[PDB]
Design a protein around this nucleic acid. Sequence first.
DNA 1: TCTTGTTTACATTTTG
DNA 2: CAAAATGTAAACAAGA
Length: 87
Amino acid sequence: SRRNAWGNLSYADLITKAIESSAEKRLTLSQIYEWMVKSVPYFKDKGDSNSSAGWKNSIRHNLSLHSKFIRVQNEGTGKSSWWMLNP
DNA sequence: TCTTGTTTACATTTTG
DNA sequence: CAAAATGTAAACAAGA
């Protein structure tokens, strides 16, 4: 009996795995979504923001909330913010 | 307008 | 038990 359609891991924990599966160990908001879709089965079929407002909002909430994650300036024009694990 | 972030509420579960 | 967590849902503000 899972805790979520995708199992017992939490959004914040899923995010961690994402960021922590990156070379520079840092992702922008958009990539984190894509990671979920490509790494988590329950989401493989939810990329269409047409059916993906719930888990995206949640993911944005988790990011912006828990000091576990920190926002780091990403150099570039029209680029989003880096998101890294807080040491 | 669609993205990004932040915040605030609420209902439940888990923790410590 | 009470506090920290969690998952949703939403209101608002500044960016691309």
